[PDB]
Amino acid sequence: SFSGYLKLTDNVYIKNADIVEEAKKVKPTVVVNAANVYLKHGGGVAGALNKATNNAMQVESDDYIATNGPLKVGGSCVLSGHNLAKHCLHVVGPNVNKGEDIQLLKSAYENFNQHEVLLAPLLSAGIFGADPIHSLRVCVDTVRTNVYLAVFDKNLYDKLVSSFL
Template sequence: MDLSNSIRLGNVEIYFLVADITKLEVDAIVNAANSHLKHGGGVAGAISRAGGPEIQKESDEYVRKYGPVEPGGVAVTSAGKMKAKYIIHTVGPIGDKEGNDEIIKKAFENIFSKVDEFKIESIAIPFIGTGIFGYPVEKFVRVCVNETCKLFANYSGSIRKVFFCDIDSHKVTLLQSEFQKTTLN
């Protein structure tokens, strides 16, 4: 795993990896989930398979207790058999509709609220909604960079390492380029 592709925002190191999110050694993994936390395909399916049946069991219990997760909302479960301690499930946008950028913004706010609540120091984040849910990669990149830079401008929480990752090198390169352009200005 190449950790040389990174930038620093305040106290936080941001990494850009072409990697299988389920294999990363981090405190938490973000899962791009559906509102009922049924982890069948995409990143959610890969995470569920890697972590074992405990993840789906905890997800089902969460939905039974609290109801479906709203778009941009989050739910936290254990990571099952994976090296991570937690999975922060978030419901991203579907397709390219008006208001979807706001869903991604809300997801980032809620993810990092849980990061601080659980004292998470390292987290892996996929390209939420850009796979099977069809949210445009370019829009995700723009919102992700804006929200991350805004969040970490004066950040004093627990997180020290953020790993943005995908198995698609084009997505990772696009995000890294946008971060570099934004942080150099």
């Protein structure tokens, strides 16, 4: 199972870890991807998860978009986890660098409540431009299921833990 996580609340845990390396090690039922509406996994967590699947995640995602059209900002879809997890929950948090409504971050985290346990990144953090401290706050106040957060940056991990209310 998950190891080396710091407990933040009854259901939220956090670790300074590369989510691809965590997924390969644990092979969770659900790994969350920090997706965009087009499921174009170019950079950040999405690019790293896709590269770990040898681009199979992108091929599957392009078929999904060809059939269904784009996701909504705040929305999600369940696809295969390939070699990383049983499933990948592609969740679209607002990209504040694209002027998307940060209030949609709570809607994005609500998708996690449809799964008993997830390995996840902080939504809208990193290249999505939101304040990661705010993202962790929204996570703990929204998600009721068991979420294991993998925060790649050590310095951000320390700041998140030391400032956690």
